Amino acid sequence: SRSYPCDEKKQNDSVIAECSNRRLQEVPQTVGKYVTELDLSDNFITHITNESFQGLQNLTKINLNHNPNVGLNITDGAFLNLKNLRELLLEDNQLPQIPSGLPESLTELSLIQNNIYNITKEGISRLINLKNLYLAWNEKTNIEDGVFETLTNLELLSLSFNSLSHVPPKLPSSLRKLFLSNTQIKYISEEDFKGLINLTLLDLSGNCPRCFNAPFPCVPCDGGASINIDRFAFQNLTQLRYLNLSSTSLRKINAAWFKNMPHLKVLDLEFNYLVGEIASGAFLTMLPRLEILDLSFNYIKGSYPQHINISRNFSKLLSLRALHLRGYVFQELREDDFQPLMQLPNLSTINLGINFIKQIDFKLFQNFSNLEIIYLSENRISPLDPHSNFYHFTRPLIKPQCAAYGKALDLSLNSIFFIGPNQFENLPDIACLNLSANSNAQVLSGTEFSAIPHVKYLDLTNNRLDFDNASALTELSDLEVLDLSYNSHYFRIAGVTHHLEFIQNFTNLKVLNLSHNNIYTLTLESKSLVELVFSGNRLDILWNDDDNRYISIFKGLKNLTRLDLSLNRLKHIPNEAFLNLPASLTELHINDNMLKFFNWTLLQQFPRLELLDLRGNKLLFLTDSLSDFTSSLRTLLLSHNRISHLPSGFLSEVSSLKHLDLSSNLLKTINKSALETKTTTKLSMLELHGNPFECTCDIGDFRRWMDEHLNVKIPRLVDVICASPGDQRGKSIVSLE
Amino acid sequence: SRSYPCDEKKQNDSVIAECSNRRLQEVPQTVGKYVTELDLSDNFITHITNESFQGLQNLTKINLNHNPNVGLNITDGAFLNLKNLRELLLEDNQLPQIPSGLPESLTELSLIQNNIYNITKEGISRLINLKNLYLAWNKTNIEDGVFETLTNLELLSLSFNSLSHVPPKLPSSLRKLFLSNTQIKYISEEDFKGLINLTLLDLSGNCPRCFNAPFPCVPCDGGASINIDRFAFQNLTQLRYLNLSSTSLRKINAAWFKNMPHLKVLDLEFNYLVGEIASGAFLTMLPRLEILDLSFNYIKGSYPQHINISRNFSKLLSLRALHLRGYVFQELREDDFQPLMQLPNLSTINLGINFIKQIDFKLFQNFSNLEIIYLSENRISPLDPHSNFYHFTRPLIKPQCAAYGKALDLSLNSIFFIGPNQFENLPDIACLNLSANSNAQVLSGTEFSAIPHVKYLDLTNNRLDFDNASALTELSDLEVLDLSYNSHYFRIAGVTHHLEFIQNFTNLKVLNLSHNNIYTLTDKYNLESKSLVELVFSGNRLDILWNRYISIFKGLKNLTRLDLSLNRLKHIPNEAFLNLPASLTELHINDNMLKFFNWTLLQQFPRLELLDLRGNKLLFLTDSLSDFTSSLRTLLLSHNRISHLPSGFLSEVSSLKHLDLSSNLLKTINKSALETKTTTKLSMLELHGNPFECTCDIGDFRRWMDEHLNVKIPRLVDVICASPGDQRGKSIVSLE
Numbered sequence A: 001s002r003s004y005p006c007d008e009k010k011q012n013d014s015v016i017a018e019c020s021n022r023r024l025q026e027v028p029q030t031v032g033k034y035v036t037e038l039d040l041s042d043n044f045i046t047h048i049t050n051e052s053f054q055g056l057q058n059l060t061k062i063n064l065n066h067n068p069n070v071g072l073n074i075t076d077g078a079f080l081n082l083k084n085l086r087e088l089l090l091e092d093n094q095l096p097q098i099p100s101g102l103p104e105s106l107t108e109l110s111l112i113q114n115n116i117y118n119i120t121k122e123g124i125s126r127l128i129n130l131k132n133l134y135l136a137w138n139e140k141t142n143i144e145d146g147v148f149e150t151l152t153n154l155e156l157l158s159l160s161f162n163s164l165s166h167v168p169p170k171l172p173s174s175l176r177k178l179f180l181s182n183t184q185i186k187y188i189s190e191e192d193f194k195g196l197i198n199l200t201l202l203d204l205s206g207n208c209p210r211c212f213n214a215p216f217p218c219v220p221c222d223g224g225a226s227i228n229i230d231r232f233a234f235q236n237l238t239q240l241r242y243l244n245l246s247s248t249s250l251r252k253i254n255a256a257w258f259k260n261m262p263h264l265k266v267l268d269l270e271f272n273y274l275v276g277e278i279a280s281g282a283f284l285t286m287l288p289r290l291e292i293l294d295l296s297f298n299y300i301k302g303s304y305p306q307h308i309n310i311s312r313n314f315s316k317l318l319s320l321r322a323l324h325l326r327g328y329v330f331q332e333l334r335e336d337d338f339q340p341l342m343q344l345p346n347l348s349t350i351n352l353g354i355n356f357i358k359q360i361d362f363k364l365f366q367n368f369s370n371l372e373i374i375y376l377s378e379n380r381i382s383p384l385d386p387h388s389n390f391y392h393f394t395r396p397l398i399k400p401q402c403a404a405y406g407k408a409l410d411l412s413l414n415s416i417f418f419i420g421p422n423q424f425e426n427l428p429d430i431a432c433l434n435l436s437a438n439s440n441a442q443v444l445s446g447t448e449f450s451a452i453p454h455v456k457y458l459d460l461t462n463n464r465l466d467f468d469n470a471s472a473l474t475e476l477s478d479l480e481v482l483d484l485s486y487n488s489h490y491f492r493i494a495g496v497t498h499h500l501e502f503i504q505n506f507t508n509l510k511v512l513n514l515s516h517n518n519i520y521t522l523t524l525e526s527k528s529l530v531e532l533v534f535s536g537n538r539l540d541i542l543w544n545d546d547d548n549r550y551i552s553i554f555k556g557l558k559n560l561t562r563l564d565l566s567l568n569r570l571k572h573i574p575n576e577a578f579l580n581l582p583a584s585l586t587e588l589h590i591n592d593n594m595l596k597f598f599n600w601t602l603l604q605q606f607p608r609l610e611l612l613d614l615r616g617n618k619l620l621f622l623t624d625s626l627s628d629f630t631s632s633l634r635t636l637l638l639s640h641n642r643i644s645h646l647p648s649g650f651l652s653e654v655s656s657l658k659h660l661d662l663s664s665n666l667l668k669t670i671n672k673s674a675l676e677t678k679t680t681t682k683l684s685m686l687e688l689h690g691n692p693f694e695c696t697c698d699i700g701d702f703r704r705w706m707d708e709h710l711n712v713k714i715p716r717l718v719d720v721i722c723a724s725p726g727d728q729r730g731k732s733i734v735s736l737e
Numbered sequence B: 001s002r003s004y005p006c007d008e009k010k011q012n013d014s015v016i017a018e019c020s021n022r023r024l025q026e027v028p029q030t031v032g033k034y035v036t037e038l039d040l041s042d043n044f045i046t047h048i049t050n051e052s053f054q055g056l057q058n059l060t061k062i063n064l065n066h067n068p069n070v071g072l073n074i075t076d077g078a079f080l081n082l083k084n085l086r087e088l089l090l091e092d093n094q095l096p097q098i099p100s101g102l103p104e105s106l107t108e109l110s111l112i113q114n115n116i117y118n119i120t121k122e123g124i125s126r127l128i129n130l131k132n133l134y135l136a137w138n139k140t141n142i143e144d145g146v147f148e149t150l151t152n153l154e155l156l157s158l159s160f161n162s163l164s165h166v167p168p169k170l171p172s173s174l175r176k177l178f179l180s181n182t183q184i185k186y187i188s189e190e191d192f193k194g195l196i197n198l199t200l201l202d203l204s205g206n207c208p209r210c211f212n213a214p215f216p217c218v219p220c221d222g223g224a225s226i227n228i229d230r231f232a233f234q235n236l237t238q239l240r241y242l243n244l245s246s247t248s249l250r251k252i253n254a255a256w257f258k259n260m261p262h263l264k265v266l267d268l269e270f271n272y273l274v275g276e277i278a279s280g281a282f283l284t285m286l287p288r289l290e291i292l293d294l295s296f297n298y299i300k301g302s303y304p305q306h307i308n309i310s311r312n313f314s315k316l317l318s319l320r321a322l323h324l325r326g327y328v329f330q331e332l333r334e335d336d337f338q339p340l341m342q343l344p345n346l347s348t349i350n351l352g353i354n355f356i357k358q359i360d361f362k363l364f365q366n367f368s369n370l371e372i373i374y375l376s377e378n379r380i381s382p383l384d385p386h387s388n389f390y391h392f393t394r395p396l397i398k399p400q401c402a403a404y405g406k407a408l409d410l411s412l413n414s415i416f417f418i419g420p421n422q423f424e425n426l427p428d429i430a431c432l433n434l435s436a437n438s439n440a441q442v443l444s445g446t447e448f449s450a451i452p453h454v455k456y457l458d459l460t461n462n463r464l465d466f467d468n469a470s471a472l473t474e475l476s477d478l479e480v481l482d483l484s485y486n487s488h489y490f491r492i493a494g495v496t497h498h499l500e501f502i503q504n505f506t507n508l509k510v511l512n513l514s515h516n517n518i519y520t521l522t523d524k525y526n527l528e529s530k531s532l533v534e535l536v537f538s539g540n541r542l543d544i545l546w547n548r549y550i551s552i553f554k555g556l557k558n559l560t561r562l563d564l565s566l567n568r569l570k571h572i573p574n575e576a577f578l579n580l581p582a583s584l585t586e587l588h589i590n591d592n593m594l595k596f597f598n599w600t601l602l603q604q605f606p607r608l609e610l611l612d613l614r615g616n617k618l619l620f621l622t623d624s625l626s627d628f629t630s631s632l633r634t635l636l637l638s639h640n641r642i643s644h645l646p647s648g649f650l651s652e653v654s655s656l657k658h659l660d661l662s663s664n665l666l667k668t669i670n671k672s673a674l675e676t677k678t679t680t681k682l683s684m685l686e687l688h689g690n691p692f693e694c695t696c697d698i699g700d701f702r703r704w705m706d707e708h709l710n711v712k713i714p715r716l717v718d719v720i721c722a723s724p725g726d727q728r729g730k731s732i733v734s735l736e
């Protein structure tokens, strides 16, 4: 009773079917009639009939996006028999018209990225229970006069990326989220939103766009014109919380728009010409509950002012929590320039990226009572997907792991070619610092970070730092995470570089990333280190038969639990060197190397090793008695290797093994001696796709084992392809006699 | 009589044999006895005996570098029979000792990158005619007076050897002494008293400043520098070249140059001479110095406001090139460069990697013949053992650009937009490099008004906007425009790209629009130019354009060279191909996905000499190429899927001198294709990498190779047989 081709799974007393991206030519009839949610996206399905989902009467959600994957002939009333269907997704299907005969039960319909030009009452007005309707990316969109009027339960109407030219009349009063982005609406009137008194979101972005790095076609509003919003256009939107007016070429903001909007929480004014409006800011007094204000990329092309002209009225934004001021472009940030922002109590984020600031007076950040994120990346500071927000930077400015430690300052991608003596003077108690991609060739000695000694997460990636001095970075006593990835040394001394003895002077350093540092010579000991990433280095050079000085390289890291030794060009690991690894290791990664052999016997000296990663290697053989070497290995990843034979009893050897990855190997068949179930194992997953399975009668022994052991979940059944013979080539091993 | 495996060639009434990089297991005996110079480098040769070069009695030069290529067992007196041998090169051979029994006739011996630890009189003292001796990259035991008998020794290079001391008893005839990275910490008065004719002295790398060293670097323990005695160079009157780079020098003694009036090149890079540059007492002792390099002399952690240049710099009357990289200073002022302004020959100022926040550009008008101003890798804001390991020898600015006149290189700076006062108060600039600045200037026709005589403008690696019809048109005399790797930052749907600015140039000859991601053109969809000669359109999307842009390049009537490579072209429309400039003499449609090519269309291009269709997926050729072209001198079809050469193809076009058919799917060449009814001037035919079926079917072509010796077939060792097993790997010319 193994499910094929869908991957059935239990989810809150229900069964979901993950049947996506598996080259299905037609809707499969081998789906259990008890499933509730069906996902058939990214397949080659071409026809949808009334007898496609027969028997599956409990289907509450159907996904049919991207079909055929790089149109879709849906018959009239094909989904009418599904009386319990609530969510129907039909995106990127090249649908010429809205599917006729849709079920009345529908509460969520998505028709994004189709060829729909007519929004008629014939295909929409019958769906009276619709909560969310998405008609994005579809000469002019013909919308029926009062097509949405009958949808009394409509909460979300998204008509973005459609040449509407005008706001559609007769919208339901129940509407809460109206999306009209890039809809060529050049004029907004008083009567346009009077009916929707419960609107919590209004998206008018992209109408009269400012063509700057647009991720889609951009055409300005002819004659430098902006969106023409009427004075009383938003006079009856009392419950408005989200207002997106990005890329609207706005030059003046009318304060009368926000006089009857006391709950406005998020205001997006990015990609506009509001340098003058930021300096005067009469509209800022009308926003006493605004929490997020984005005024990014509002620069005047060719204008490089000495300072930023921030209005005094910015002090009236009492509820402000985050201010995004990227792309303003100014040469200097002085203490007096940010005076109207220091008294704000909840302001914890200041975004100032891509401003080309030659120098910032860092003494002003002490005045901000509750700052937590100071994003100054991509400046000139010197030593000493249709379901996305296309205009706002939604990804966290500073990595959550870093910002979690406290005060976060991002000085990455600046002109800090060395750490000056007054680099961090007069700064707050910074606990997260980013100095990435600064080409910083500082010779660290132990006094550079004395002004901010409580840095717990330090990012020094993509630099040319020199940490050979035994006291480098040791001034940061409470340091826990150190990132030195992609560090190309600049003062390499023959009998000195690399000298990693600075690590021993840290009582609480937990994570260290020395990846891609080109470490091929040393000249390590730690009581608190837990994870070391040594990938992208030259361990093959360090582990040679001439000098055996690097046999006990990581033996001093007694508390180490995670070690990444990938991408080290390791052809062979000396047995003595492998045995001198931390016995406390619970996760070892020797993937993406050139390991021809692996001594499985040595695993005896690591009784807590749970995850062994040997992917992307050139291994050929496995051991006959893995139980005799490990009694804890829960996961063993051996994908992309040259293993051609599974040894006798391998599946029953280690009883603690729950995940075994053998995908993309050279396995022709699995013999009955390897499947011997004398003992009971808890193998919950076995990957085998990409193997050249000989689909003759020899594979029959393994086929029966799959049906007997249903608990061993084998993923990607459609990708477990038979390489021989011709008639069975391409087909799955489970589709045989 | 076709030469194999060497490539014999005439050179000034002599025969040279290019027998390099051909996987030779042993010295070949199939070399014509009349050859003079033999090159057997980068091969797998393991043994050298007295009967290896037998018969080749006229060998004046033998090269045996890198053997075996990634040691060399040379017998005693293996080269003694070669009485005319002058130049013997034995580099990277893992030679444990200097080869014994070397011929007395030798005038040039190179033993670089070997395991030679003893320089004994047994293997050197007999060679009395040696002009040049190279013993670099080999403690080193040097015999007391081993070089004393070499009365004709002009060049002695003992660099990259742990010598510790200058070898005693060197010949007085020495003119070029090389002692770089030799661990010589002390230099005395008696060390160079014997060599009165020394024109070059290299003491670099002794007590090195470990900064970005290209080889192992160990400082002189205790921050010490090279200890040069006061009177160490008191008898080197003819010294012209002095290299003291990476010597950790902090003070330069002026008494060193009191008896050195002809010193021309002084290298002081990678030192600690910031204080010595400010006081410069030694600068008065150099009235004929032409090249002064003081690069990478910065104090680590020191970022001064200005550069402290000594007043004594004005006494360097003969100075023509000053290299001041890696000093690291925030601001260049007119006052700081006052000592250099009255020098009558100063033509080059190197100021790269200085992190200068801003320069007062009106100081550059104060020079006499300032031809090169290199300011790359600064912070200016809007408005191989045979190499010089310490000096930047490659031209600072491309020769093609600097030849136009005064050249200013402002690449890799902080100029994110061309400010209004970006070029005000600058000299009459003829070459301008604004590369890799992330310049997002919307060019309108007034940005370069202060320097309107720019003839070669390099605007590569920027985010420029040239959609305005009057962009760059202020540079009336513009000849070369380089817009490579330009990522449009303000792409307007019905406007970008708009290349109508090109038509307003009366003398624009070369335009490089490579990798600009040009997949859409507007209004004047077609480009028009009366003076353009070369257009590089590679790295664009011509497949999208040709899938209303049929006559895209038809307006460039004077165009002779066109590069349409890397355009993801699967099929070129016949109408579009015919609407190409008829004046084209060189077309490059290589590195695409062309399945078919209409050879018939070549009739409308009577001046086309070079057709490049490499790296494509072509399968067939035409039966009557003579009927379509009467000028095609070169046809490159390498890396394609051509499996059959049509009948008479080699005799069709008589003007064809070079035909490239390498890395194709040719199994054999039939006798109908080799039909020589007419006489052709095919001087070269490439065929390596083809899966040649080395059966009796290849015999027809083998005879044609011997009959037509004028058709030179290069890389004979790489024309490998794919079948059968016994002939697999072997060359097609090594068959019965």
Ligand SMILES: *[C@@H]1O[C@H](CO)[C@@H](O[C@@H]2O[C@H](CO)[C@@H](O[C@@H]3O[C@H](CO[C@H]4O[C@H](CO)[C@@H](O)[C@H](O)[C@@H]4O)[C@@H](O)[C@H](O[C@H]4O[C@H](CO)[C@@H](O)[C@H](O)[C@@H]4O)[C@@H]3O)[C@H](O)[C@H]2NC(C)=O)[C@H](O)[C@H]1NC(C)=O
Pocket (backbone or CB within 6 Å): A177, A181, A201, A203, A205, A242, A243, A244, A266, A268, A385, A386, A387, A388, A389, A390, A391, A392
């Ligand atoms: C103009 O400005 C407005 C306001 O900022 C923007 O509106 C936002 O638009 C985005 C994209 O359309 C919306 O994001 C999506 O929200 C869905 C609902 O989220 C709620 O529910 C989930 C639980 O179901 C909660 O976790 C969540 O916190 C919310 O309470 C999500 O289901 C979506 O997720 C899917 O897409 C993302 C991105 O691809 C994936 O990472 C997810 O895994 C998942 O597949 C998505 O996050 C957002 O909610 C809108 N805001 C509001 C308040 O409605 C406009 O987009 C903007 N216009 C332009 C053109 O920029």
Ligand SMILES: *[C@@H]1O[C@H](CO)[C@@H](O[C@@H]2O[C@H](CO)[C@@H](O[C@@H]3O[C@H](CO[C@H]4O[C@H](CO)[C@@H](O)[C@H](O)[C@@H]4O)[C@@H](O)[C@H](O[C@H]4O[C@H](CO)[C@@H](O)[C@H](O)[C@@H]4O)[C@@H]3O)[C@H](O)[C@H]2NC(C)=O)[C@H](O)[C@H]1NC(C)=O
Pocket (backbone or CB within 6 Å): A401, A402, A461, A481, A483, A485, A511, A512, A513, A531, A533
């Ligand atoms: C230098 O080396 C360091 C150390 O390895 C790297 O830092 C780590 O990077 C990894 C990613 O590469 C981080 O792991 C990720 O953490 C995310 C957040 O985890 C928190 O939140 C979840 C709940 O949302 C908690 O369960 C968790 O305990 C944490 O509190 C996860 O969401 C990520 O999960 C994704 O990947 C895993 C596989 O790795 C999947 O199984 C998941 O389904 C999911 O797709 C992921 O685990 C890790 O946290 C970082 N550590 C630190 C200390 O920062 C640096 O990135 C590296 N530097 C460079 C330049 O490469």
Ligand SMILES: *[C@@H]1O[C@H](CO)[C@@H](O[C@@H]2O[C@H](CO)[C@@H](O[C@@H]3O[C@H](CO[C@H]4O[C@H](CO)[C@@H](O)[C@H](O)[C@@H]4O)[C@@H](O)[C@H](O[C@H]4O[C@H](CO)[C@@H](O)[C@H](O)[C@@H]4O)[C@@H]3O)[C@H](O)[C@H]2NC(C)=O)[C@H](O)[C@H]1NC(C)=O
Pocket (backbone or CB within 6 Å): B176, B180, B200, B202, B204, B241, B242, B243, B265, B267, B384, B385, B386, B387, B388, B389, B390, B391
């Ligand atoms: C310290 O400073 C001194 C002085 O600057 C440096 O000395 C120079 O060292 C280089 C490298 O050893 C020398 O360069 C070589 O010169 C050979 C001779 O050149 C003359 O003859 C040819 C004609 O035969 C003329 O064209 C030329 O103008 C000269 O008159 C060349 O034959 C060499 O060429 C070969 O190598 C180069 C580079 O790989 C290739 O491009 C060529 O194709 C060819 O294969 C080479 O150019 C230079 O001549 C020395 N100067 C003097 C005045 O002798 C020291 O090297 C420096 N020390 C350190 C450690 O940096």
Ligand SMILES: *[C@@H]1O[C@H](CO)[C@@H](O[C@@H]2O[C@H](CO)[C@@H](O[C@@H]3O[C@H](CO[C@H]4O[C@H](CO)[C@@H](O)[C@H](O)[C@@H]4O)[C@@H](O)[C@H](O[C@H]4O[C@H](CO)[C@@H](O)[C@H](O)[C@@H]4O)[C@@H]3O)[C@H](O)[C@H]2NC(C)=O)[C@H](O)[C@H]1NC(C)=O
Pocket (backbone or CB within 6 Å): B400, B401, B460, B480, B482, B484, B510, B511, B512, B534, B536
């Ligand atoms: C954007 O596009 C432009 C135009 O194509 C590029 O500029 C040209 O770049 C090529 C190289 O890619 C240049 O060609 C080279 O010129 C050298 C100088 O030529 C003169 O000097 C030599 C003697 O030193 C004379 O023999 C010659 O006749 C000229 O007077 C040559 O030395 C080079 O020759 C070598 O390569 C060729 C094959 O390419 C061999 O046949 C030769 O034997 C030799 O090995 C070569 O010809 C060309 O001069 C540049 N033109 C201009 C106007 O500058 C840009 O580089 C490109 N930009 C980017 C970023 O790619």
Ligand SMILES: *[C@@H]1O[C@H](CO)[C@@H](O[C@@H]2O[C@H](CO)[C@@H](O[C@@H]3O[C@H](CO)[C@@H](O)[C@H](O)[C@@H]3O)[C@H](O)[C@H]2NC(C)=O)[C@H](O)[C@H]1NC(C)=O
Pocket (backbone or CB within 6 Å): A377, A397, A398, A399, A402, A410, A412, A413, A434, A435, A436, A437, A459, A462
């Ligand atoms: C410290 O600052 C650096 C520099 O800004 C941060 O590095 C940047 O991190 C982001 C997110 O990981 C990278 O962006 C991603 O790039 C991939 C590949 O193009 C893309 O698929 C993702 O969607 C996303 O855009 C970015 O490339 C990277 N930049 C550099 C220069 O490394 C770093 O994350 C910051 N560290 C902390 C602790 O916050």
Ligand SMILES: *[C@@H]1O[C@H](CO)[C@@H](O[C@@H]2O[C@H](CO)[C@@H](O[C@@H]3O[C@H](CO)[C@@H](O)[C@H](O)[C@@H]3O)[C@H](O)[C@H]2NC(C)=O)[C@H](O)[C@H]1NC(C)=O
Pocket (backbone or CB within 6 Å): B376, B396, B397, B398, B401, B409, B411, B412, B433, B434, B435, B436, B458
């Ligand atoms: C204008 O300024 C730019 C930036 O300084 C110059 O580009 C640089 O040119 C050099 C020489 O062509 C490049 O170096 C070469 O790289 C190749 C490939 O690695 C190598 O084979 C050569 O030996 C040499 O090192 C360099 O990469 C390139 N840098 C960039 C950022 O493009 C440009 O040449 C200048 N143009 C003019 C007209 O002066």
Ligand SMILES: Cc1cc(-c2cc3[nH]nc(N[C@@H]4CCNC[C@H]4F)c3cc2C2CC2)cc(C)n1
Pocket (backbone or CB within 6 Å): A297, A299, A300, A301, A302, A303, A304, A327, A328, A329, A354, A378, B416, B417, B438, B439, B440, B441, B442, B463
């Ligand atoms: C005409 C003009 C242009 C710019 C400008 C130039 C620019 N050049 N490069 C920019 N950004 C690159 C990509 C992101 N990372 C940094 C760089 F690589 C950039 C941004 C910008 C304005 C958005 C701030 C500023 C002004 C006043 N006027």
Ligand SMILES: Cc1cc(-c2cc3[nH]nc(N[C@@H]4CCNC[C@H]4F)c3cc2C2CC2)cc(C)n1
Pocket (backbone or CB within 6 Å): A417, A418, A439, A440, A441, A442, A443, A464, B296, B298, B299, B300, B301, B302, B303, B326, B327, B328, B353, B377
């Ligand atoms: C401790 C210290 C370091 C530097 C310095 C930093 C640097 N950061 N990055 C440098 N150069 C990279 C390669 C070339 N291109 C730009 C970058 F990529 C570089 C050079 C340098 C000294 C040679 C000038 C300067 C000073 C006073 N003190």
Ligand SMILES: *[C@@H]1O[C@H](CO)[C@@H](O)[C@H](O)[C@H]1NC(C)=O
Pocket (backbone or CB within 6 Å): A033, A034, A035, A055, A056, A057, A058
């Ligand atoms: C649908 O689900 C209900 C339980 O919610 C169950 O009683 C019924 O048998 C299911 N019907 C089908 C066709 O699976």
Ligand SMILES: *[C@@H]1O[C@H](CO)[C@@H](O)[C@H](O)[C@H]1NC(C)=O
Pocket (backbone or CB within 6 Å): A318, A319, A320, A345, A346
């Ligand atoms: C700050 O945020 C908290 C919720 O995190 C809220 O209770 C408080 O009232 C806010 N303060 C102001 C002044 O808006």
Ligand SMILES: *[C@@H]1O[C@H](CO)[C@@H](O)[C@H](O)[C@H]1NC(C)=O
Pocket (backbone or CB within 6 Å): A339, A363, A364, A366, A367
């Ligand atoms: C805060 O700013 C005020 C002026 O706005 C100044 O008087 C005060 O000293 C500053 N304090 C700190 C800690 O920055």
Ligand SMILES: *[C@@H]1O[C@H](CO)[C@@H](O)[C@H](O)[C@H]1NC(C)=O
Pocket (backbone or CB within 6 Å): A444, A445, A446, A447, A469, A470, A471
């Ligand atoms: C190492 O750092 C210490 C502390 O700053 C300093 O005193 C010492 O001179 C440095 N030593 C080296 C070898 O750089």
Ligand SMILES: *[C@@H]1O[C@H](CO)[C@@H](O)[C@H](O)[C@H]1NC(C)=O
Pocket (backbone or CB within 6 Å): A510, A527, A528, A529, A530, A559
């Ligand atoms: C090992 O690491 C953990 C986490 O950093 C730490 O709490 C623990 O004290 C360390 N154990 C020893 C023995 O140092």
Ligand SMILES: *[C@@H]1O[C@H](CO)[C@@H](O)[C@H](O)[C@H]1NC(C)=O
Pocket (backbone or CB within 6 Å): A575, A576, A579, A599, A600, A601, A602
């Ligand atoms: C594993 O290593 C031990 C030494 O640590 C050695 O005796 C044994 O033969 C090795 N086994 C294999 C299969 O290499």
Ligand SMILES: *[C@@H]1O[C@H](CO)[C@@H](O)[C@H](O)[C@H]1NC(C)=O
Pocket (backbone or CB within 6 Å): B033, B034, B035, B055, B056, B057, B058
């Ligand atoms: C060597 O060259 C001379 C002419 O310079 C010639 O007469 C003689 O025959 C040549 N010898 C050999 C062996 O080729």
Ligand SMILES: *[C@@H]1O[C@H](CO)[C@@H](O)[C@H](O)[C@H]1NC(C)=O
Pocket (backbone or CB within 6 Å): B317, B318, B319, B344, B345
């Ligand atoms: C300048 O250089 C030229 C040769 O290019 C030379 O004739 C002239 O005398 C030099 N002038 C001085 C003052 O050295």
